[PDB]
Enzyme design. Structure first.
Site, PDB file in Angstrom:
ATOM      1  N   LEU A  21      25.553  19.782 -53.451  1.00 26.67           N
ATOM      2  CA  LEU A  21      25.121  20.181 -54.607  1.00 26.67           C
ATOM      3  C   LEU A  21      23.750  21.206 -54.401  1.00 26.67           C
ATOM      4  CD1 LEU A  21      23.707  16.159 -55.564  1.00 26.67           C
ATOM      5  CD2 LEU A  21      25.575  17.744 -56.871  1.00 26.67           C
ATOM      6  N   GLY A  26      17.076  22.155 -45.578  1.00 26.78           N
ATOM      7  CA  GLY A  26      18.611  22.813 -45.772  1.00 26.78           C
ATOM      8  C   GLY A  26      19.441  22.201 -46.931  1.00 26.78           C
ATOM      9  N   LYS A  50      21.340  15.460 -47.435  1.00 25.93           N
ATOM     10  CA  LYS A  50      20.749  16.152 -47.013  1.00 25.93           C
ATOM     11  C   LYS A  50      20.911  16.532 -45.224  1.00 25.93           C
ATOM     12  CE  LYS A  50      16.170  18.623 -47.779  1.00 25.93           C
ATOM     13  NZ  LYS A  50      15.036  18.623 -47.947  1.00 25.93           N
ATOM     14  N   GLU A  98      18.642   8.975 -53.024  1.00 26.13           N
ATOM     15  CA  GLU A  98      19.083   8.435 -54.658  1.00 26.13           C
ATOM     16  C   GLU A  98      19.893   9.412 -54.905  1.00 26.13           C
ATOM     17  OE1 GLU A  98      15.834   6.555 -55.969  1.00 26.13           O
ATOM     18  OE2 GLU A  98      16.148   4.296 -56.183  1.00 26.13           O
ATOM     19  N   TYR A  99      20.900   9.225 -55.623  1.00 27.52           N
ATOM     20  CA  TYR A  99      21.065  10.418 -56.361  1.00 27.52           C
ATOM     21  C   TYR A  99      20.796  10.560 -58.585  1.00 27.52           C
ATOM     22  CZ  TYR A  99      25.112  13.461 -58.991  1.00 27.52           C
ATOM     23  OH  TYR A  99      25.426  13.900 -59.466  1.00 27.52           O
ATOM     24  N   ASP A 154       3.689  21.037 -55.814  1.00 26.60           N
ATOM     25  CA  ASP A 154       4.062  21.763 -56.021  1.00 26.60           C
ATOM     26  C   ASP A 154       4.730  21.075 -57.427  1.00 26.60           C
ATOM     27  OD1 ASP A 154       5.863  24.429 -56.977  1.00 26.60           O
ATOM     28  OD2 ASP A 154       7.360  22.989 -55.579  1.00 26.60           O
ATOM     29  N   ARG A 158      10.950  21.625 -62.539  1.00 27.08           N
ATOM     30  CA  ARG A 158      11.787  21.619 -61.580  1.00 27.08           C
ATOM     31  C   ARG A 158      11.834  20.693 -60.743  1.00 27.08           C
ATOM     32  NH1 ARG A 158       8.243  26.672 -61.323  1.00 27.08           N
ATOM     33  NH2 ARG A 158       7.434  25.752 -58.492  1.00 27.08           N
ATOM     34  N   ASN A 159      11.494  19.859 -60.327  1.00 25.34           N
ATOM     35  CA  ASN A 159      11.053  19.169 -58.686  1.00 25.34           C
ATOM     36  C   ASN A 159      11.158  17.808 -59.533  1.00 25.34           C
ATOM     37  OD1 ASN A 159      11.496  20.531 -56.897  1.00 25.34           O
ATOM     38  ND2 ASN A 159       8.724  21.397 -56.459  1.00 25.34           N
ATOM     39  N   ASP A 172      11.041  15.891 -54.031  1.00 25.72           N
ATOM     40  CA  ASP A 172      10.585  16.725 -52.270  1.00 25.72           C
ATOM     41  C   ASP A 172       8.779  17.161 -53.032  1.00 25.72           C
ATOM     42  OD1 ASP A 172      12.829  17.806 -52.200  1.00 25.72           O
ATOM     43  OD2 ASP A 172      12.669  19.773 -53.402  1.00 25.72           O
TER      44      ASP A 172
END
Length: 278
Positions: A21, A26, A50, A98-99, A154, A158-159, A172
Site C-alpha cells: 500500500l 515503515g 505495518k 483497519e483497511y 498533523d 491527506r491524514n 496517524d
C-alpha cells in the site's frame, strides 16, 4: 525480543500478506486476516499491516512499538483507524489495523471534481450534504481523540482515510506548515486548539474538493502573513456559515477557537439542514 500481549496477538499464519500500500515509520501492506473474530474463525477480513523496512533502525522499531501501545490505550472509535491485532512472536513485528479501500480524503475529493481533475479515473460527484457529513465525521473523530487527551499535530485531508462504505477515519494520530496554527509554527506549542486550527484548513480542503491551501504562497512568508491577519478566501462553492466556521477555527487567539465538541454540534445541525439535493 518483544513481549506477547494476548489481548492483541494473532498467529502469523492467520495473516495472508497482499499488495504494497506504500510507505506509511515503515511500510504498509494490504492483507487478509483469517478468523480475526475468534468466534467466527472461517471468515477472512481485509486489513492493513505495518512492518519495518529492510534498512530500518532501532529508532524505527521503538517508534513502531510506541505507536502500537499508544493505539491500545486510546481505544476504539468508528472515525479513527483502529488497532485490530499484532504478530509479535514468530519473527518481524506486524501491527494490524483497519483497511480503508478508498484511500485518503484529499485524493478522494480531487477525483470527484467535475471536468482541475488530475485523475484519468474520475468518480461520481459528491452532494453538498456529503461534504458537510464528511466534515462532521472528521470532527467526531477528533472529538474522540481530544477526549482521550490525544493531540494529533498533523491533521489534514491527506491524514483522513475513507473506507469502502465512505466512513471517514483519522490516520496517524499516535505518532505541512500550511496546516499548522501560528503558535505551533512559531513556538512548537501544539494543543487541542492548534488541531482545531488544522481542522479549519481541512474544512477548506473539503469545500475546494482537495485544493492546495495558500496556493503560491512561499513557506518562509506564510507566518508573517498569518501574524498580519492573512486568512484564506472563501472557496467559490461554500456557504457563508461554513466559511465562518473556518474563520473561527483560525482565530489568532487559541482560547477563542471553537472546541471539537462544539464543532461537532454545529456540524450536526448543518448536516440536518442540508438536503440530499442542494
Amino acid at each position: 525480543e518483544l513481549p506477547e500481549d494476548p489481548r492483541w496477538e494473532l498467529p502469523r499464519d492467520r495473516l495472508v500478506l497482499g499488495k504494497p500500500l506504500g510507505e506509511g515509520f515503515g511500510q504498509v501492506v494490504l492483507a487478509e486476516a483469517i478468523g480475526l473474530d475468534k468466534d467466527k474463525p472461517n471468515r477472512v477480513t481485509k486489513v492493513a499491516v505495518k512492518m519495518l523496512k529492510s534498512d530500518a533502525t532501532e529508532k524505527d522499531l521503538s517508534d513502531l512499538i510506541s505507536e502500537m501501545e499508544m493505539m491500545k490505550m486510546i481505544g476504539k472509535h468508528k472515525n479513527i483507524i483502529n488497532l485490530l491485532g499484532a504478530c509479535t512472536q514468530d519473527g518481524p513485528l506486524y501491527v494490524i489495523v483497519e483497511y480503508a479501500s478508498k484511500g485518503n480524503l484529499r485524493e478522494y475529493l480531487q477525483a470527484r471534481r467535475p471536468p482541475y481533475n488530475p485523475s484519468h479515473n474520475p468518480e461520481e460527484q459528491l452532494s453538498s450534504k456529503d461534504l458537510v457529513s464528511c466534515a462532521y465525521q472528521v470532527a467526531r473523530g477528533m472529538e474522540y481523540l481530544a477526549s482521550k487527551k490525544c493531540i494529533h499535530r498533523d491533521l489534514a485531508a491527506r491524514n483522513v482515510l475513507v473506507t469502502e462504505d465512505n466512513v471517514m477515519k483519522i490516520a496517524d494520530f499516535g505518532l505541512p506548515v500550511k496546516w499548522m496554527a501560528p503558535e505551533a509554527l512559531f513556538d512548537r506549542i501544539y494543543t487541542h486548539q492548534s488541531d482545531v486550527w488544522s481542522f479549519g484548513v481541512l474544512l477548506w480542503e473539503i469545500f475546494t474538493l482537495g485544493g492546495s491551501p495558500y496556493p503560491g504562497v512561499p513557506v518562509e512568508e506564510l507566518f508573517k502573513l498569518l501574524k498580519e491577519g492573512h486568512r484564506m478566501d472563501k472557496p467559490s462553492n461554500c456557504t457563508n456559515e461554513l466559511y465562518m466556521m473556518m474563520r473561527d477555527c483560525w482565530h489568532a487567539v487559541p482560547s477563542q477557537r471553537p472546541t471539537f465538541k462544539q464543532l461537532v454540534e454545529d456540524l450536526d445541525r448543518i448536516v440536518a439542514l442540508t438536503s440530499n439535493q442542494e
